Design a protein around this ligand. Structure first.
Ligand SMILES: Nc1nc2c(ncn2[C@@H]2O[C@H](COP(=O)(O)OP(=O)(O)O)[C@@H](O)[C@H]2O)c(=O)[nH]1
Ligand SMILES: [Mg+2]
Lengths: 171, 351
């Protein structure tokens, strides 16, 4: 009885896009570059407050290189919420969002919660996926959307809060 | 007045895990053991190991595919004796060299010392030990084969940016500290995590000037520092360095163990244990014939099998491969040219 709800979260998306950095910013409000790549699955915990309710979040950060997909897909089925990340400077990462949603369709629970996040939104001079493009896509799917920056902290907290509210409502 | 190389050969022979060693003595062995370096093996060799000590003695162990083991000692005076060694259940000689073997089981070792697992330092320190011990080869199929699928090696340059400055790296037995690693990151043209190497480095390697600067900040002897510069000036050095960090090398081994790794991840997150997800320790060598061999290790925390609860260890995955001449630092060329073997072991603490 030290928390009111316990949600499992999963972070999927291409290698490179900032999944670990988002998680690190959410869990510790820090950003550095002293970390080697994620090998397999990483895990962190953060408790939040939402409508006077204490929510324990168990978040899993996957590796997104193609060869990891199989083992990684075994982590979908338990999740309450799945965040799909792409890099706003990397068109290929956004194109692949379509595949990541199929993996969700294939391996997630039928009524799992989704969120689309376009990370690195501080790289303005390099940005190649427009907000309106990504936002129209998330719309057609009825999925919430934000652009974020693990680096500046832009919208990182919103992202997880939003996901948590989404799950809270479902339950 | 006994040499470094002689000392190590005595230990390996009597047994690194021998119960009659005074623990303060196990200290000594570490310092010797970690000079050991995998290097390019000849055609009928399963593994070849080399150690060049600061007293100017060197040691060389060969292990034939038939597992016949010979050492060659060079005393500082440059005398050569060749010793024929035997591995058995008392010394566990073959368990205690950086070699991959065709065993029917993943090899288990016991970490020697109070090597705890609280933080970043202890973990690196663990991998620093395990990557001198043996590993058991694991086959892949098309699904787990790190070089098959639609995009083999897609992540290397990202993998290299994040790895350099956060790794233990050794070039011809010469330790390349974090500062020097950073210079290397620059010298390859990987200033930021999105770029590929410079067209120039891809074709001509690192400029002699960078190469020289990198070695000046690095540790080891002046003769050794010389081979490092000569090594980095090859186009192939770029290929060895970046390929060394490919994350998916680890898929065969995790395909076997990941649930137990995750279990350990959660055990640690539930206790505020600030442990990294993974650690890297690479050894790259170019023989006096110009042969380039890479040995890359990833260490990752792992729970003992169900029978021994709340106990924790490290899984070390070893990836070995020659970089043949003419193979340049491009994704497309790394794929159809490089041929890695994968091997793993599990090491458990003395807690
Ligand atoms: N400018 C900027 N760079 C970022 C941001 N997030 C991540 N990066 C960079 O991209 C690299 C990859 O991040 P990472 O979390 O390892 O991607 P992962 O493969 O999804 O875990 C990091 O080393 C960061 O340098 C961001 O919000 N802004
Ligand atoms: Mg990651």
């Amino acid at each position: 009885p030290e928390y009111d709800y316990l949600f499992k979260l999963l972070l999927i998306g291409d290698s490179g896009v900032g999944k670990s950095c988002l998680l690190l910013r959410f869990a510790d409000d820090t950003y550095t570059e002293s970390y080697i790549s994620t090998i397999g699955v990483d895990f962190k915990i953060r408790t939040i407050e939402l409508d006077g309710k204490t929510i324990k979040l168990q978040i899993w950060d996957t590796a997104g290189q193609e060869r990891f997909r199989t083992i990684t897909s075994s982590y979908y089925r338990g999740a309450h919420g799945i965040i799909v990340v792409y890099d706003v400077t990397d068109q290929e990462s956004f194109n692949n969002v379509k595949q990541w949603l199929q993996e969700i369709d294939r391996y997630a629970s039928e009524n799992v919660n989704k969120l689309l996040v376009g990370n690195k939104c501080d790289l303005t001079t390099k940005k190649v996926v427009d907000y309106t493009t990504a936002k129209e896509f998330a719309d057609s799917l009825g999925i919430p959307f934000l652009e974020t920056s693990a680096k500046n902290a832009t919208n990182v907290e919103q992202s997880f809060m939003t996901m948590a509210a989404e799950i809270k409502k479902r339950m | 007045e006994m040499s470094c190389a002689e000392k190590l050969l005595k230990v390996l022979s009597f047994g690194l895990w021998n119960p009659t060693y005074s623990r303060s003595e196990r200290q000594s062995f570490q310092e010797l053991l970690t000079v050991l370096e995998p290097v390019y093996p000849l055609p009928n060799e399963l593994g070849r190991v080399s150690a060049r000590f600061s007293d100017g003695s060197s040691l060389r162990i060969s292990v034939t595919n038939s597992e016949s083991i010979e050492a060659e000692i060079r005393t500082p005076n440059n005398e050569k004796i060749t010793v024929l060694l035997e591995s058995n259940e008392q010394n566990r000689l073959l368990q205690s060299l950086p070699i991959d073997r065709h065993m029917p089981y993943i090899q288990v070792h016991r970490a020697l010392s109070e090597m705890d697992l609280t933080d970043t330092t202890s973990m690196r320190n663990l991998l620093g030990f395990t990557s001198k011990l043996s590993t058991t080869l694991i086959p892949h199929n098309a699904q787990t084969d790190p070089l098959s699928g639609p995009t083999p090696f897609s992540s290397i340059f990202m993998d290299t940016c994040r790895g350099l400055g956060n790794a233990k790296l050794s070039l011809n037995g010469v330790d390349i500290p974090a500062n020097a690693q950073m210079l290397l990151r620059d010298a390859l043209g990987l200033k930021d995590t999105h770029s590929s190497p410079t067209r120039n480095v891809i074709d001509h390697g690192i400029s002699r000037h960078d190469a020289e600067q990198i070695a000046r900040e690095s540790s080891g002897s002046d003769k050794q520092k010389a081979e490092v510069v000569e090594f980095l000036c090859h186009p192939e050095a770029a290929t060895a360095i970046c390929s060394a960090f490919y994350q998916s090398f680890n898929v065969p081994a995790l395909t076997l163990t990941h649930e137990r790794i995750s279990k350990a991840s959660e055990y640690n997150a539930e206790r505020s244990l600030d442990t990294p997800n993974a650690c890297i320790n690479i050894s790259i060598s170019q023989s006096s014939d110009g042969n380039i061999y890479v040995t890359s290790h990833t260490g990752v925390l792992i729970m003992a099998p169900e029978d021994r609860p709340n106990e924790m260890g490290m899984l070390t995955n070893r990836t070995s491969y020659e970089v043949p001449q003419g193979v340049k630092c491009i994704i497309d060329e790394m794929v159809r040219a490089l041929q890695p073997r994968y091997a793993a072991s599990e090491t458990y603490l003395q807690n």
